[PDB]
Design a protein around this ligand. Structure first.
Ligand SMILES: COCCCN1C=C(N)c2cc(S(N)(=O)=O)sc2S1(=O)=O
Ligand SMILES: [Hg+2]
Ligand SMILES: [Zn+2]
Length: 258
């Protein structure tokens, strides 16, 4: 059956239809801060989200995605461990049913309440479709969310959630500024990995920021009221839409900070 996060179609079952699930560079992974290699050759990240053009927000049955117009170099990510320019195409979150879980990546086994993923594709390849067939096609900027004070930049997103409660629903979501979701520091960990959801394609250069952003419990609570199910179907709360940590195998997590 189509994949999900439940007992019968969750992560532990993905390998059956997506054999790459047991591959060599699978994500997420536990970032062991004591084994991560500080690397001085890593340039600082260059986040140019000033001309970002958000188009809409959609509930796809696995999470809610905010999509952006990537027809041109509007919102891009450069520098860091990247060669070339990567265009922002969408961002989504993974969250849990309780504040002590939700993130996909963990830091020294610590799970955060949620994790924001800003998906970018390598312009060198022409289009998103070609990028996903390439061993450096995607760059996903991951940001952890911890329950504390409210994140004002996240409110516009929280306010529209009622309109996309169920699978398949979408709502116009223009003029959203993704910069309001960035933490203060751009320090990060980076490693070669994959999409954390099927098709689990292996070509994401993961860039996980060190500093998490704070969101109120009320803000994360609204995430938890979404539905995996489409309208008319039995209600299944959208929570715990995260993949557990995969074995690091033959990889090293580089750090841009000491
Ligand atoms: C062949 O088409 C593949 C399409 C993959 N896309 C959908 C996934 N759910 C997905 C998961 C992503 S994540 N969470 O690992 O960054 S990104 C992302 S995605 O690159 O925007
Ligand atoms: Hg790939
Ligand atoms: Zn994700």
């Amino acid at each position: 059956h189509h994949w999900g996060y439940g007992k019968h179609n969750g992560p532990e079952h993905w390998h059956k239809d997506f054999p790459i699930a047991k591959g060599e560079r699978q994500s997420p992974v536990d970032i062991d801060t004591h084994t991560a290699k500080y690397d001085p050759s890593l340039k600082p990240l260059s986040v140019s989200y000033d001309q970002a053009t958000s188009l809409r927000i959609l509930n796809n049955g696995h999470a809610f995605n905010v999509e952006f117009d990537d027809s041109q170099d509007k919102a891009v990510l450069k520098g860091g461990p990247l060669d070339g320019t990567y265009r922002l195409i969408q961002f989504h979150f993974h969250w849990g049913s309780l504040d002590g879980q939700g993130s996909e990546h963990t830091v020294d086994k610590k799970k955060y309440a949620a994790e924001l993923h800003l998906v970018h594709w390598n312009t060198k390849y022409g289009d998103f479709g070609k990028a996903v067939q390439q061993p450096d096609g995607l760059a996903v900027l991951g940001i952890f969310l911890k329950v504390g004070s409210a994140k004002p930049g996240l409110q516009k997103v929280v306010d529209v959630l009622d309109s996309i409660k169920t699978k398949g629903k979408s709502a116009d979501f223009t003029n959203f500024d993704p910069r309001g979701l960035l933490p203060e520091s751009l320090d990060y960990w980076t490693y070669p990995g994959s999409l954390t959801t099927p098709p689990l394609l292996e070509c994401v250069t993961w860039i996980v920021l060190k500093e998490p952003i704070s969101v109120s419990s009320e803000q994360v609570l609204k995430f938890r009221k979404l539905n995996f199910n489409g309208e008319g179907e039995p209600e299944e709360l959208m929570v715990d839409n995260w993949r557990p940590a995969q074995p690091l195998k033959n990889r090293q997590i580089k750090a841009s900070f000491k």
